[PDB]
Design a protein around this ligand. Structure first.
Ligand SMILES: [Ca+2]
Length: 223
Protein backbone atom coordinates (compact mmCIF):
# COMPACT_ATOMS: atom_id res chain seq x y z
CA UNK A 1 0.00 0.00 0.00
CA UNK A 2 1.45 3.35 -1.07
CA UNK A 3 0.37 6.49 0.76
CA UNK A 4 -1.71 4.60 3.30
CA UNK A 5 -1.71 4.38 7.10
CA UNK A 6 -0.99 1.76 9.74
CA UNK A 7 -4.32 -0.02 10.18
CA UNK A 8 -3.83 -1.06 13.78
CA UNK A 9 -3.42 -4.61 15.10
CA UNK A 10 -6.36 -6.79 14.06
CA UNK A 11 -8.56 -3.89 12.92
CA UNK A 12 -9.13 -5.74 9.64
CA UNK A 13 -10.16 -9.19 11.00
CA UNK A 14 -10.88 -10.66 7.56
CA UNK A 15 -7.43 -9.83 6.18
CA UNK A 16 -5.31 -12.92 5.71
CA UNK A 17 -1.70 -13.39 4.66
CA UNK A 18 -0.85 -16.20 2.25
CA UNK A 19 2.43 -17.77 3.31
CA UNK A 20 4.66 -20.19 1.40
CA UNK A 21 7.65 -19.77 3.69
CA UNK A 22 7.15 -16.03 3.36
CA UNK A 23 4.24 -13.67 2.67
CA UNK A 24 3.44 -13.51 -1.04
CA UNK A 25 -0.18 -12.34 -1.24
CA UNK A 26 -3.16 -11.21 0.77
CA UNK A 27 -6.60 -12.78 0.95
CA UNK A 28 -10.05 -12.35 2.50
CA UNK A 29 -11.74 -14.74 4.93
CA UNK A 30 -15.36 -15.26 3.81
CA UNK A 31 -16.25 -18.07 6.25
CA UNK A 32 -14.54 -20.33 8.79
CA UNK A 33 -12.87 -22.49 6.18
CA UNK A 34 -12.71 -20.48 2.92
CA UNK A 35 -10.50 -17.64 1.72
CA UNK A 36 -10.86 -15.59 -1.44
CA UNK A 37 -7.78 -14.26 -3.22
CA UNK A 38 -6.44 -13.50 -6.70
CA UNK A 39 -5.92 -16.31 -9.20
CA UNK A 40 -2.53 -14.86 -10.12
CA UNK A 41 -1.55 -15.57 -6.51
CA UNK A 42 -1.79 -19.32 -7.14
CA UNK A 43 0.97 -21.67 -6.07
CA UNK A 44 1.21 -24.94 -4.13
CA UNK A 45 2.18 -25.31 -0.48
CA UNK A 46 -0.04 -22.51 0.82
CA UNK A 47 -0.48 -21.80 4.52
CA UNK A 48 -3.17 -19.30 5.45
CA UNK A 49 -2.28 -16.93 8.28
CA UNK A 50 -5.17 -15.24 10.09
CA UNK A 51 -5.13 -12.75 12.96
CA UNK A 52 -1.93 -11.22 11.65
CA UNK A 53 -0.57 -7.70 12.17
CA UNK A 54 3.23 -7.80 12.20
CA UNK A 55 3.96 -10.77 9.90
CA UNK A 56 7.47 -11.25 11.34
CA UNK A 57 6.53 -11.50 15.03
CA UNK A 58 4.18 -13.86 16.90
CA UNK A 59 1.92 -11.44 18.75
CA UNK A 60 -0.82 -13.66 20.16
CA UNK A 61 -3.80 -13.71 17.80
CA UNK A 62 -2.43 -15.71 14.89
CA UNK A 63 -3.99 -18.84 13.41
CA UNK A 64 -1.82 -20.75 10.94
CA UNK A 65 -3.84 -23.20 8.84
CA UNK A 66 -2.61 -24.97 5.70
CA UNK A 67 -4.83 -24.98 2.63
CA UNK A 68 -6.50 -28.26 1.65
CA UNK A 69 -7.30 -27.09 -1.87
CA UNK A 70 -7.11 -24.16 -4.23
CA UNK A 71 -9.68 -23.39 -6.90
CA UNK A 72 -8.73 -20.88 -9.57
CA UNK A 73 -11.71 -19.47 -11.49
CA UNK A 74 -12.56 -21.65 -14.51
CA UNK A 75 -12.11 -18.74 -16.90
CA UNK A 76 -8.99 -17.13 -15.45
CA UNK A 77 -6.79 -15.63 -18.17
CA UNK A 78 -3.29 -14.91 -16.84
CA UNK A 79 -2.46 -12.85 -19.94
CA UNK A 80 -5.30 -10.37 -19.50
CA UNK A 81 -5.93 -11.02 -15.82
CA UNK A 82 -9.63 -11.36 -16.63
CA UNK A 83 -11.37 -13.34 -13.84
CA UNK A 84 -8.44 -12.87 -11.47
CA UNK A 85 -10.01 -14.70 -8.54
CA UNK A 86 -9.45 -17.97 -6.70
CA UNK A 87 -10.77 -19.79 -3.65
CA UNK A 88 -8.74 -21.46 -0.93
CA UNK A 89 -10.19 -23.98 1.53
CA UNK A 90 -8.56 -24.35 4.95
CA UNK A 91 -7.64 -27.82 6.22
CA UNK A 92 -9.44 -27.01 9.47
CA UNK A 93 -12.03 -24.36 10.27
CA UNK A 94 -10.62 -21.14 11.72
CA UNK A 95 -11.81 -20.02 15.15
CA UNK A 96 -13.83 -16.86 14.55
CA UNK A 97 -13.94 -14.06 17.13
CA UNK A 98 -13.66 -10.27 16.91
CA UNK A 99 -9.98 -10.18 15.91
CA UNK A 100 -10.51 -12.96 13.36
CA UNK A 101 -13.79 -12.76 11.45
CA UNK A 102 -15.22 -13.32 7.99
CA UNK A 103 -16.29 -10.56 5.62
CA UNK A 104 -19.69 -10.60 3.93
CA UNK A 105 -20.05 -11.05 0.17
CA UNK A 106 -21.94 -8.34 -1.78
CA UNK A 107 -25.65 -8.62 -2.57
CA UNK A 108 -25.17 -5.89 -5.18
CA UNK A 109 -22.25 -4.31 -7.04
CA UNK A 110 -20.54 -1.20 -5.70
CA UNK A 111 -20.74 2.09 -7.60
CA UNK A 112 -18.17 4.65 -8.68
CA UNK A 113 -17.57 7.23 -5.96
CA UNK A 114 -18.12 4.81 -3.09
CA UNK A 115 -15.30 4.82 -0.54
CA UNK A 116 -13.58 1.54 0.29
CA UNK A 117 -10.85 0.17 2.54
CA UNK A 118 -7.93 -1.52 0.80
CA UNK A 119 -5.30 -3.28 2.90
CA UNK A 120 -2.20 -5.45 2.69
CA UNK A 121 1.48 -5.96 3.49
CA UNK A 122 2.64 -4.89 0.04
CA UNK A 123 5.30 -2.41 -1.09
CA UNK A 124 4.84 1.11 0.31
CA UNK A 125 6.95 2.98 -2.23
CA UNK A 126 6.17 3.93 -5.84
CA UNK A 127 9.88 4.05 -6.63
CA UNK A 128 12.16 1.57 -4.91
CA UNK A 129 11.05 -1.15 -2.25
CA UNK A 130 10.03 -1.07 1.26
CA UNK A 131 8.04 -3.90 2.83
CA UNK A 132 6.03 -3.05 5.95
CA UNK A 133 5.91 -5.66 8.70
CA UNK A 134 2.53 -4.45 9.98
CA UNK A 135 -0.73 -4.16 8.03
CA UNK A 136 -1.24 -0.96 6.03
CA UNK A 137 -4.61 0.61 5.19
CA UNK A 138 -5.90 2.89 2.43
CA UNK A 139 -9.32 4.49 2.04
CA UNK A 140 -10.01 5.14 -1.63
CA UNK A 141 -12.97 5.76 -3.96
CA UNK A 142 -14.16 3.51 -6.77
CA UNK A 143 -13.49 5.27 -10.07
CA UNK A 144 -15.93 5.49 -12.98
CA UNK A 145 -15.73 2.80 -15.64
CA UNK A 146 -15.07 5.63 -18.09
CA UNK A 147 -11.95 6.98 -16.38
CA UNK A 148 -10.73 3.42 -15.75
CA UNK A 149 -10.99 2.46 -19.42
CA UNK A 150 -9.43 5.75 -20.49
CA UNK A 151 -6.48 5.05 -18.20
CA UNK A 152 -6.08 1.50 -19.52
CA UNK A 153 -7.33 1.38 -23.14
CA UNK A 154 -8.43 -2.07 -24.28
CA UNK A 155 -7.55 -3.70 -20.95
CA UNK A 156 -10.51 -3.24 -18.59
CA UNK A 157 -13.21 -5.93 -18.74
CA UNK A 158 -16.61 -6.06 -17.06
CA UNK A 159 -14.94 -8.10 -14.30
CA UNK A 160 -12.68 -5.19 -13.34
CA UNK A 161 -12.99 -1.76 -11.75
CA UNK A 162 -10.43 0.90 -10.84
CA UNK A 163 -10.08 2.51 -7.42
CA UNK A 164 -7.75 5.21 -6.16
CA UNK A 165 -6.79 8.42 -7.94
CA UNK A 166 -5.67 9.44 -11.41
CA UNK A 167 -3.38 11.88 -9.60
CA UNK A 168 -1.43 9.04 -8.02
CA UNK A 169 0.36 9.05 -4.67
CA UNK A 170 -2.08 6.52 -3.19
CA UNK A 171 -2.66 2.98 -4.43
CA UNK A 172 -2.20 -0.71 -3.63
CA UNK A 173 1.04 -2.34 -4.81
CA UNK A 174 3.10 -5.51 -5.27
CA UNK A 175 2.53 -7.75 -2.28
CA UNK A 176 -1.02 -6.52 -1.72
CA UNK A 177 -2.29 -8.78 -4.52
CA UNK A 178 -5.21 -11.02 -3.59
CA UNK A 179 -6.09 -8.68 -0.74
CA UNK A 180 -9.45 -7.05 0.10
CA UNK A 181 -11.28 -3.98 -1.12
CA UNK A 182 -14.17 -3.51 1.30
CA UNK A 183 -16.98 -1.03 0.79
CA UNK A 184 -19.91 -0.61 3.19
CA UNK A 185 -18.96 -3.76 5.06
CA UNK A 186 -18.85 -5.93 1.91
CA UNK A 187 -16.07 -7.50 -0.15
CA UNK A 188 -16.40 -5.69 -3.48
CA UNK A 189 -12.89 -6.13 -4.84
CA UNK A 190 -9.62 -8.04 -4.92
CA UNK A 191 -6.25 -6.30 -5.43
CA UNK A 192 -5.44 -7.45 -8.98
CA UNK A 193 -3.13 -5.25 -11.03
CA UNK A 194 -1.91 -1.88 -12.23
CA UNK A 195 0.99 -0.23 -14.05
CA UNK A 196 3.59 0.24 -11.35
CA UNK A 197 2.28 1.76 -8.12
CA UNK A 198 0.63 5.10 -7.37
CA UNK A 199 1.82 6.61 -10.65
CA UNK A 200 -0.14 9.38 -12.35
CA UNK A 201 -2.96 8.19 -14.64
CA UNK A 202 -2.38 4.56 -13.62
CA UNK A 203 -4.84 3.80 -10.79
CA UNK A 204 -5.23 0.37 -9.19
CA UNK A 205 -7.29 -2.29 -10.96
CA UNK A 206 -9.40 -4.71 -8.92
CA UNK A 207 -11.37 -7.89 -9.52
CA UNK A 208 -15.11 -7.11 -9.39
CA UNK A 209 -16.26 -9.61 -6.74
CA UNK A 210 -19.98 -8.98 -7.17
CA UNK A 211 -19.82 -10.77 -10.55
CA UNK A 212 -18.57 -13.94 -8.84
CA UNK A 213 -21.01 -14.34 -5.95
CA UNK A 214 -22.93 -17.16 -7.60
CA UNK A 215 -19.71 -19.00 -8.46
CA UNK A 216 -18.32 -18.48 -4.95
CA UNK A 217 -21.43 -19.74 -3.16
CA UNK A 218 -21.91 -22.69 -5.52
CA UNK A 219 -18.27 -23.73 -5.34
CA UNK A 220 -18.32 -23.61 -1.53
CA UNK A 221 -21.52 -25.65 -1.38
CA UNK A 222 -19.89 -28.54 -3.27
CA UNK A 223 -16.35 -28.47 -1.88
CA1 LIG B 1 2.32 -12.07 13.69
Amino acid sequence: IVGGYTCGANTVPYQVSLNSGYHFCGGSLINSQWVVSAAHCYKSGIQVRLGEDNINVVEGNEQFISASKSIVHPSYNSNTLNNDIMLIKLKSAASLNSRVASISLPTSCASAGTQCLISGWGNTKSSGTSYPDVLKCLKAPILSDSSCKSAYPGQITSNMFCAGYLEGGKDSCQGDSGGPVVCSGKLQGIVSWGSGCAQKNKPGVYTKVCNYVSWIKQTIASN
